[PDB]
Amino acid sequence: SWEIDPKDLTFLKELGTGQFGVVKYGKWRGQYDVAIKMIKEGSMSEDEFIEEAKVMMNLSHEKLVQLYGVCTKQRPIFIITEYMANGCLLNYLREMRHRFQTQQLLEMCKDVCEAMEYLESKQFLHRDLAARNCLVNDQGVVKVSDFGLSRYVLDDEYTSSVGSKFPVRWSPPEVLMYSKFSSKSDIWAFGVLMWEIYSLGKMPYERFTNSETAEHIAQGLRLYRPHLASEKVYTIMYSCWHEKADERPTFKILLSNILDVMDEE
Numbered sequence: 001s002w003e004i005d006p007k008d009l010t011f012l013k014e015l016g017t018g019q020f021g022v023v024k025y026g027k028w029r030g031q032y033d034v035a036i037k038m039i040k041e042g043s044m045s046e047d048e049f050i051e052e053a054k055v056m057m058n059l060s061h062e063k064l065v066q067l068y069g070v071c072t073k074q075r076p077i078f079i080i081t082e083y084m085a086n087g088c089l090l091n092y093l094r095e096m097r098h099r100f101q102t103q104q105l106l107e108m109c110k111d112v113c114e115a116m117e118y119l120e121s122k123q124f125l126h127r128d129l130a131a132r133n134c135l136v137n138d139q140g141v142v143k144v145s146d147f148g149l150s151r152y153v154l155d156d157e158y159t160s161s162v163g164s165k166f167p168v169r170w171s172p173p174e175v176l177m178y179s180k181f182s183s184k185s186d187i188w189a190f191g192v193l194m195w196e197i198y199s200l201g202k203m204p205y206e207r208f209t210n211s212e213t214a215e216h217i218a219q220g221l222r223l224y225r226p227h228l229a230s231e232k233v234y235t236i237m238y239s240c241w242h243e244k245a246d247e248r249p250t251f252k253i254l255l256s257n258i259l260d261v262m263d264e265e
């Protein structure tokens with residue numbers, strides 16, 4: 001079921017490079033748009049991924065980028081997914097031409113929050129939630145991408161909490177100090193993502209290094225309010241950053257809060 005015949009693919013344009021190498025845009029059976037990850041040799045724990053691919057193909061939600069299948073009878077193996085015409089959320093936010101209204105920004109947060117509440121319902125962690133790992137389709141809908149894939153990355157610079165690629169700025173204190181990953185580390189990262197959205201893609205803690213950020217966070221300092229966020233929006237993002245993990249909300253609660261502010265604003 002998971003298995004796609006690579007002969008059914010027509011490759012058309014390069015989309016860029018990520019943690020597992022090049023990704024292309026193409027067509028499946030002459031007709032259907034798809035993105036195709038061509039997994040770089042040595043970048044991925046391929047046999048582990050392939051077993052997990054079966055669980056991932058049952059994750060289906062309108063705000064999650066859909067996995068369509070894998071091509072495994074070969075090397076490089078390919079991962080085939082839904083295509084998102086406007087690319088990564090971070091770069092979309094940084095394009096000032098969009099002149100976003102705050103109602104649009106809140107809708108992006110709600111899109112992600114729906115996807116994350118679905119994952120939480122399935123006890124599945126993203127592990128690398130950030131605007132760089134959300135994608136935007138041709139209707140301006142945001143969807144969460146590459147959830148779970150951090151587990152198969154072979155690169156020590158990405159996996160170590162002191163690596164140059166580790167997502168320090170998206171991590172709660174208990175992840176930085178003890179590697180304690182949970183639903184509540186996704187919640188923390190979601191707060192940082194809302195902050196990214198409302199800051200139009202500024203880097204979190206933009207004047208600090210990763211090392212200084214970790215120390216700031218441990219002393220209890222936080223990101224402060226983006227100019228575009230109302231007080232009510234800021235309360236929601238700030239709630240994700242409680243020092244104590246069990247005092248942070250769930251994605252179900254966060255969704256309820258976002259819907260309430262949409263109605264008020």
Ligand SMILES: CN1CCN(c2ccc(Nc3cc(-c4cccc(-n5ccc6cc(C7CC7)cc(F)c6c5=O)c4CO)cn(C)c3=O)nc2)CC1
Pocket residue numbers: 015016017018019020022023035037065081082083084085086087088128132133135145146147148149150151153
């Ligand atoms: C001027 N611009 C040039 C670029 N244009 C433009 C650009 C991309 C698109 N669409 C898509 C891009 C992509 C994509 C393309 C390249 C790299 C990546 N990436 C990015 C990050 C990451 C992170 C991980 C972490 C979890 C371990 C794993 C990973 F595997 C990755 C990965 O693979 C991704 C996202 O999966 C995926 N889909 C599914 C698209 O649909 N559409 C228009 C926009 C206009």
